[PDB]
Amino acid sequence: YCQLTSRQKLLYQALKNLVMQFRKVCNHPELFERQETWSPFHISLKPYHISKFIYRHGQIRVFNHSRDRWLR
Amino acid sequence: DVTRIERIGAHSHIRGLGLDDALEPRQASQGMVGQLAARRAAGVVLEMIREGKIAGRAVLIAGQPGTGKTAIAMGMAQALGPDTPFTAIAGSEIFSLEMSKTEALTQAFRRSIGVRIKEETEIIEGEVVEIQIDRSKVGKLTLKTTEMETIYDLGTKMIESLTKDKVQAGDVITIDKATGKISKLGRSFTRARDGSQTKFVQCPDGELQKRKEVVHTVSLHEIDVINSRTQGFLALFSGDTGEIKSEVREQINAKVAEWREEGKAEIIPGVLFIDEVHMLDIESFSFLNRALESDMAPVLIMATNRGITRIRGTSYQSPHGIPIDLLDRLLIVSTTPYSEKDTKQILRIRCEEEDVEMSEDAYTVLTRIGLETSLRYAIQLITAASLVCRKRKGTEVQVDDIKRVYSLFLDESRSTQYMKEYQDAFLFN
Amino acid sequence: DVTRIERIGAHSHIRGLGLDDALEPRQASQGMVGQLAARRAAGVVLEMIREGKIAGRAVLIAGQPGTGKTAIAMGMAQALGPDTPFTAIAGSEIFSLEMSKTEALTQAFRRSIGVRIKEETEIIEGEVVEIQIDRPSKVGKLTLKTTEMETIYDLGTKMIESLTKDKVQAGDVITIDKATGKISKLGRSFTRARDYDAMGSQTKFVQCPDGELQKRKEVVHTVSLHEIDVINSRTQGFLALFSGDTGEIKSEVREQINAKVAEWREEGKAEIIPGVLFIDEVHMLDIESFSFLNRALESDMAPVLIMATNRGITRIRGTSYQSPHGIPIDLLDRLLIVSTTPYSEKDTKQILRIRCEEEDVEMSEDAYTVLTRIGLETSLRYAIQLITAASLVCRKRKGTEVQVDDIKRVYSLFLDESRSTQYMKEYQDAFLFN
Amino acid sequence: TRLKSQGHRVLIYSQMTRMIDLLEEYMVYRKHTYMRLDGSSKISERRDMVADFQNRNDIFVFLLSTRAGGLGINLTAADTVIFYDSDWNPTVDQQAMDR
Amino acid sequence: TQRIASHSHVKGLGLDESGLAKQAASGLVGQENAREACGVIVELIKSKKMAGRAVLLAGPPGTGKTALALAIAQELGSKVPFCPMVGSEVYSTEIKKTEVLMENFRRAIGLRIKETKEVYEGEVTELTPCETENKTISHVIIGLKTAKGTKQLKLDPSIFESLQKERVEAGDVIYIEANSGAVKRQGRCDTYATEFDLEAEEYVPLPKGDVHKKKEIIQDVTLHDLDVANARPQGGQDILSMMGQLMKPKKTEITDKLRGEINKVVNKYIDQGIAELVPGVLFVDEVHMLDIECFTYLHRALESSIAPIVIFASNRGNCVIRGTEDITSPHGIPLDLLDRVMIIRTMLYTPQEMKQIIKIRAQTEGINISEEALNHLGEIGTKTTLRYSVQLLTPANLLAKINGKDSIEKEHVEEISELFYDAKSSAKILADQQDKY
Amino acid sequence: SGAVKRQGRCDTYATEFDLEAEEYVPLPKGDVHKKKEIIQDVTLHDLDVANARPQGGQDILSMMG
Ligand SMILES: Nc1ncnc2c1ncn2[C@@H]1O[C@H](COP(=O)(O)OP(=O)(O)O)[C@@H](O)[C@H]1O
Ligand SMILES: Nc1ncnc2c1ncn2[C@@H]1O[C@H](COP(=O)(O)OP(=O)(O)O)[C@@H](O)[C@H]1O
Ligand SMILES: Nc1ncnc2c1ncn2[C@@H]1O[C@H](COP(=O)(O)OP(=O)(O)O)[C@@H](O)[C@H]1O
Incomplete structure (x- = not known):
């Protein structure tokens, strides 16, 4: 006499909430998925938008670049 | 039926601030009832900020606990209108171990002020009927819209961008003629027949290639982070940036002043809002004065529920929980009970x-x-x-x-x- | 004349609590003498820990200075046995500028609980006859000798990379794992190493093994929940365990580790054993750690702990009001007090x-x-x-x-x-x- | 595993074919050689698998089904028989064990 | 088996369908007004139409406030996220005290997301890079062999960088996904295990099924996990993401712009209907330990429209506010926050109701106690405290196992109560010897 | 300063390709070589900051920086 498990109790009790699939799923969890491939969820964020004027005149290195030359 | 991120709060039951052309508040308007003088003064402040001809002015809101002055403040923020800078902070939020209190408050004054810059760029958009590529590599594609039909030839870089993202027959996409990034907006209903079937977009109308003027507003703190850090998006979104040097900020201020002198761009004053200012340090209390005495400063409003109370850090009991130096710097509007x-x-x-x-x-x-x-x-x-x-x-x-x-x-x-x-x-x- | 790392000490001479099978205290046994009440109570907590069916319990010990409050904790510590985990921490140790006090408390609670895992592996142990490698992937053979049987095996790419990385030459007794892939050289043979090249390297010698070449061994180990949480939190942080640089581990990772360990207990591959947390002079601990300890003790994985209090009726640090034993009434009433009679x-x-x-x-x-x-x-x-x-x-x-x-x-x-x-x-x- | 130190013959009786396939996939990772007997493979492959059971090397077990394994013939070297569950038919356990 | 927990015997509030509180249900007795008061609260959380609500629990220590919190946690179910928090946890050296309270909301609110993934997996028969003039690799050519069939596919130089990162060689089984771009390696096929008698690499059998398979995966993630993923680039295919993966994961503050962007993308997911958002419950125990600054931020926090429901626990009366050094406030909570929170009154348990708790806990511990020892434990419990009689259950059972008795006896309870000292008696003994302390 | 900046490809070459990634600007008016007089003032703090710690701002394209 073999006792059931958590998967057999959840699959047996949750199914009653064809009936032969329960008789086939009583010994082992063939109907339900015991092993399923799992992968982490991937999320993509919208890329940052920077204006052309903010790119040309944006950085402070282009204004002081000659002053930075004098720093070197 | 679906539950949106927003839910009904205390300040969410009202939308906008009811006013008149003569600035006579109605008994019940825009969900708000009573406080005629408070809504009139707040309306005067709102018209002042909407004017935006001056800078560096402060006005304080006072009232008993439960008078809803925070509700009239959030309602004023709703009645402010879109595309205008607004920032809401609390007195206890500026305290952090990562960043100093002065750099945090100054950071708020930077986030409040903003700049509007308009540009023009050539962007192509439309449905793609056919694409042909022969491997340098030479290929040609067909761009069809309801009004007109065109055929284009691609270079090496355009062929690389096409082979990077595969596009089937009759797919509505947006091709940028500047950067070269091809983005697929959707698939036509008739052309998408015969896959994932994610979305369906109708064929666009109008001219295929147009010059669009882009109105883009950037924040001074955003530009300052972008310039200070190697990557300002990773610095700002990561939160690791802090204690930025004041020399770079001053140089950015001078360059923005040069931009306003050129007239190619304009600066838009923002609305700063401070909550629970009754308890705050005299360092921030004293720094607000000079921060307002600066050339370019946003228009701020602060809320204090408590009355006369001892300020934090000193044994002196200040009126309204604020020192006389800051009290004399701004005007106070008192609210009556309901x-x-x-x-x-x-x-x-x-x-x-x-x-x-x-x-x-x-x-x-x-x-x-x-x-x-x-x-x-x-x-x-x-x-x-x-x-x-x-x-x-x-x-x-x-x-x-x-x-x-x-x-x-x-x-x-x-x-x-x-x-x-x-x-x-x-x-x- | 040889002196170990351990030397004679005040509480070091105690070999145990000196208890009978009836748990009734004996006057003189296992280096402890007197105080039959606290010896019997220590027997109750030792039998309780050996039962291990109940979790989340706190036992407090109070008395006059010089009554042996630490001698009892060392008595149960030595009488508990080597296979049962034991941890002794001080209130000033959990205070650190790198990590928070509450996080240190979580490291203490998760540190006290031990986990025993057994592993069965088949390894090959024998004396190398010859080693051959062909480089054009490199393919070579390895011939081994034992007194019972002489064997010949073929080596793969990763195996040749491992042996060449380990500088293995013919004439050395080595141990190779099939499933793991690790190779560990034990030594060299006396007769096979008697004739060597003019280099003349003298290191070590090991006799030839006997019996079957491939044997199955069982090696049991114990891993702490804090150790697993640091390793899996730091993303290959094996060095951060001995370095101690890790801190402020996210709670979600700890929850997932608790659920996965529970799943391991349901599978039966790993077993969970209780552990003891000893705290001396807890009266100086901040009241915040007490408020966090009362609610944190309610967890199912929270092990039973034992605290000691030297004085009584003293204000708590950070508060201006006096409380008995420097402990709030919530915790003081939350745990049982065991008084020690003066000698x-x-x-x-x-x-x-x-x-x-x-x-x-x-x-x-x-x-x-x-x-x-x-x-x-x-x-x-x-x-x-x-x-x-x-x-x-x-x-x-x-x-x-x-x-x-x-x-x-x-x-x-x-x-x-x-x-x-x-x-x-x-x-x-x-x-x-x- | 207790029968591994013994080293007798083991036969598994499974009414469901999916349980036999999962038993082959689970037994394949354990390095345990075996053979599946069902109503799928041809009588030639089943005849070769039944004729290869004499002095079979490394195969200590056999997979069988109610009707397919209880069809007929015999298993000479088989000793230990394990039933996964009842066949929902009278005497089917004795007839399946008769092989 | 599972280790016994103090609150494990509490299965919920134990309320009927009409909302009234039964005398004894779900392992809880008494507190009919408190449980009946929570019967509307669970209907509010299950209704989800309201936000920014805080319910304070006021009662003496040991009256089951935490038992009511965890009882509601068990009543709402496993789908409803429940986040416990202690007042001492908000203090951290890495991040500010406010960032913890702000992150506890995102950690409270849960989100269910369905993701459709296309999977290409199987044995790799051939892999070769293409060569293009700038010696750069423009494209990759990799064939896939499976029991169903063989199909050659082309991959990008980034995917090739992940393959060379995984040390992928010909004859191995790999796992490739499209939208995520990550590359995994299952292992070498079992067919090649016979050529080498000894090999370090473990062998896995050849998978079955079509190479390309589209499948739906329903995962439950928290807005705080999403907020950390968007906050720091820990995961990814970038070499900088690998270096940061090697770096220590210290806590950092999240910007309000990132939070608003999260609200935007999650709002778009709700508009698409693929993602299902569920509200959480934030529990705060020992709230009197929280700082007046934390309360000051709790003013705006509770008034927020997106804030999940928060329950507070206060076991103390009038006390000095933390950090004020002068002003004392009821329940350690200032009048500003205390005016906003909703207070629930809790009453001490009666002498008759205490014995039932002692019996229920005695049965939960697995101990057989006679009626005489039950009446004695109830008597001494009413003399001092309930917690004491709760703690006296196990040691008396130990003495019963030592003496061989099947049940606890008055001599066992008398011996245990003789060994252990009550807080009142000990506090009285500290007075005589206080000079020696 | 010795710096080099690339504005874009000449407008005359824009008609050969129907689709090209490089932007096109008209031929800039004015002399090829322009002589101007610029007087720059630099505080000591910026010099002491750039020379205090390794700058690392030589190449932004580097992944290590
Ligand atoms: N004009 C108004 N009309 C209707 N309700 C209001 C109005 N102003 C405030 N309230 C009510 O006041 C509540 C918030 O008050 P609050 O701003 O906290 O007061 P205080 O600023 O004095 O603390 C809201 O729930 C809202 O229903
Ligand atoms: N039960 C005991 N048996 C033997 N020696 C003891 C015992 N209790 C205390 N001592 C001795 O008394 C000395 C001082 O004890 P101390 O650590 O002051 O006790 P407490 O920690 O209770 O103040 C120790 O060196 C120890 O050897
Ligand atoms: N009404 C009740 N019925 C059953 N057990 C209770 C009840 N109230 C409290 N308890 C038990 O008493 C124990 C101590 O309660 P405690 O958490 O100290 O209460 P509080 O949180 O009010 O201080 C808890 O483990 C709980 O299981």
Whole structure:
């Protein structure tokens, strides 16, 4: 006499909430998925938008670049 | 039926601030009732900020706890209008171990002010009927829209961008002629026939290639982070940036001044808002004065619920929890408590906002609860009363159900009365 | 003459609690003497820990200074056994500038609980005959010899990379794991290494193994929940365990580790065993750690803990109001208090007699009268130090039996705290910040 | 595993074919050689698998089904028989064990 | 088996369908007004139409406030996220005290997301890079062999960088996904295990099924996990993401712009209907330990429209506010926050109701106690405290196992109560010997 | 300063390709070589900051920086 498990109790009790699939799923969890491939969820964020004027005149290195030359 | 990120709060029941061309507030407008002088002064401040011809002015809001001045502040923020800079912060939020209090407050003054810059760029968009590529590599594609049909030839880089993202026959996409990034907006209904089937977009209309003027507003703190850090998006979104040098900020201020002198771009003053300023350090209290005395400063409004109280850090008791130096720097607008006649009106409009059907005896007894106790407690009583009415299955809330909820939840004064009897058993009385 | 890392100490001589099978306390056993009440209660908590069916319990010990409150905790610590995990932490240790005090408390609770995992692996152990490698992937063979059987195996790419990385040459006894892939060279053969190249490298020699070449072994290990949480939190953080640089681990990772460990217990591959957390002088701990400890103890994985309190009726640090044992009433009422009765004159003679067998110092019968009187007027710790230095001066006089004159010499050399206070009152005006 | 130190023959009786396939996939990772007997493979492959059971190397077990394994013939070297569950038919356990 | 927990015997509030509180249900007795008061609260949380609500629990220590919190946690179910928090946890050296309270909301609110993934997996028969003039690799050519069939596919140089990162060689089984771009390696096929008698690499059998398979995966993630993923680039295919993966994961503050962007993308997911958002419940125990600054931020926090429901626990009466050094407030909570929170009154248990708790806990511990020992434990419990009689259950059972008795006896309870000391008696003993302390 | 900046490809070459990634600007008016007089003032703090710690701002394209 073999006792059931958590998967057999959840699959047996949750199914009653064809009936032969329960008789086939009583010994082992063939109907339900015991092993399923799992992968982490991937999320993509919208890329940052920077204006052309903010790119040309944006950085402070282009204004002081000659002053930075004098720093070197 | 779906639950949006936003849910009904205390300030969410009102939308906008009701005013008139003569600045005479209505008794009930835009969900707000009463406080004629408060809504008039706040309307004057709103028209001042909408003018935006001056800079570096402060105005304070004062009133008793429960007067809803925070609700008129959030309602003023809603009535401010889109595409205008606004920032909401609290007095306790500026304290952080990662960044100094002065760099955090100055960071708020930077986030408040913003700049509007307009550009023009050539962008192609439309449905792609066919694509051909021959491998340098030479290929040609067909761009068809409802109005016209065109054929284009691609270079090496364009062929690389095409082979990077595969596009099938008859797919509506947007091709940028500047960067070279191809983005597929959708698939045509007729061309998408015969896959994932993610989305469907109709064929675009108009000219294929147009020059669009892009209106883009950037923040001074955003530009300052972008320039200071190697990657300002990773610095700002990561939060690792802090203690930015003031020399770079001054250079950016001079360059923005040069931009305004050129006239190619314009600067838009922002609206800073500070909550619970009754408790704050004299370092920030003193720094607000000079920060407002700076050339370019946003227009701010601060809320203080408490009255005369000792400020934090010193043993001196300041009036209104603020030193006289900052008190004389700004103007104060005091709010009066709500009238009994306005209380039942607020209760009724909260019934309309929360979709609750009550009776006149319910509004009368709840009005008594508003007379003996603060209105917020009654607003918290009706919310739990609707559910008890649902358990009673009745289509209208009853005074008996209001008595059941009133028996379930007790006021702070009552909990104080029982806590006086059980206080000896409580720890550290 | 060889001295280990361990040396004689105050609580080190205790080999256990000295309890019977009935758990009734014995007067003298396992290096502990007297205090039948606290010995019996310590038996109750030891039998309770050995039961391990109940979790989330706190036991407090209180009494006068010098009653052996630490000696009892060391008694149950040594009597608990090597296979059962034990952790002894101090209130000042969990205070750190790198990580928060509550996080240190979580590291203590998750650190006390041990996890025992068994592993069965088949390894190959034998003496290498020859090693051949062909490089064009490199393919080579390895011929091994044992007294029972001589074998020949083929090597793959990763195997040749591992052996060449380990600098393995013919004539060395090595151990190769099939499933793991690790190779560990034990040594060289005497006869096979007797004839060597002119390089003449002398390192080590190992005799040829006997029996089957491939054998199945079982190696059991124990891993701490804090160790697993650091390893999996740092994303290959094996160095962060010994480095201690990790801190402020996210709670979600800890929850997932708890659920996965529960799943392992459901699978039966890994077993969970209880552990003990000893805290001494907890009265100085901040009240915030107490409020976090009361609610944090309600967890199912929270092990039983034991605290000790030296004083009573003292204000808590950070608060201006006094509380019994420097502990709030929520925690003080949350745990059981075990009071220790002060020792009597009859027990002191036996305590001082234990040092005779422990320190191997012959004591005369006349020395227990004056030494016992010094134990009555002064502290038993000062009596033990008087025994040690008295034995030093006894060796200085080269006598086998202790003489009273030597004890008077040590008593003249060292003064009690009360005496140092008496002279400190006369010279106190010249002393700084009187 | 207790029968591994013994080293007798083991036969598994499974009414469901999916349990036999999962038993082959689970037994394949354990390095345990075996053979599946069902109503799928041809009588030639089943005849070769039944004829290869004499002095079979490394195969200590056999997979069988109610009707397919209880069809007929015999298993000479088989000793230990394990039933996954009942066949929902009378005497089917004795007839399946008769092989 | 599972280790016994103090609150494990509490299965919920134990309320009927009419909302009234039964005398004994779900392992809880008494507190009919408190449980009946929570019966509307669980209907509010299950209703989800309201936000920014805080319910304070006021009661003496040991009256089951935490048992009511965890009882509601068990009543709402496993789908409703429940986040416990202690007042001492908000203090951290890495991040500010406010950032913890702000992150506890995102950690409270849960989100269910369905993701459709296309999977290409199987044995790799051939892999070769293409060569293009700038010696750069423009494209990758990799064939896939499976029991169903063989199909050659082309991959990008980034995917090739992940393959060379995984040390992928010909004859191995790999796992490739499209939208995420990550590359995994299952292992070498079992067919090649026979050529080498000894090999370090473990062998896995050849998978079955079509190479390309589209499948739906329903995962439950928290807005705080999403907020950390968007906050720091820990995961990814970038070499900088690998270096940061090697770096220590210290806590950092999240910007309000990132939070608003999260609200935007999640709002778009709700508009698409693929993602299902569920509200959470934030529990705060020992709220009197929280700082007045934390309360000051709780003013705006509770008034927020997106804030999940928060329950507070206060076991103390009038006390000095933390940091004020002067002003003392009821329940350690200032009048500003205390006016906003909703207070629930809790009453001490009666002598008759205590014995039932002692019996229920005695049965939960698995101990057989006679009626005499039950009446004695109830008597001494009413003399001092309930917690004491709760703690006296196990040791008396230990003495019963030692003496061989099947049940606890008055001599066992008398011996255990004789060994252990009550807080009152000990506090009285500290007075005589206080001079020696 | 010795710096080099690339504005874009000449407008005359824009008609050969129907689709090209490089932007096109008209031929800039003015002399090829322009002589101007610029007087720059630099505080000591910026010099001491750039020379205090390694700058690392030589190449932004580097992944290590
Ligand atoms: N003009 C108004 N009309 C209706 N209700 C209001 C109005 N102003 C405030 N309230 C009510 O006041 C509550 C918030 O008050 P609050 O801003 O906290 O007061 P205080 O600023 O004095 O603390 C809201 O729930 C809202 O229903
Ligand atoms: N039960 C005991 N048996 C033997 N020696 C003891 C016992 N209890 C205390 N001692 C001795 O007393 C000395 C001082 O004990 P101490 O650590 O001051 O006790 P407490 O920690 O209770 O103050 C120790 O060196 C120890 O050897
Ligand atoms: N009404 C009740 N019925 C059953 N057990 C209770 C009840 N109230 C409290 N308890 C038990 O008493 C124990 C101690 O309660 P505690 O958490 O200290 O209460 P509080 O949180 O009010 O201080 C808890 O483990 C709980 O299981």
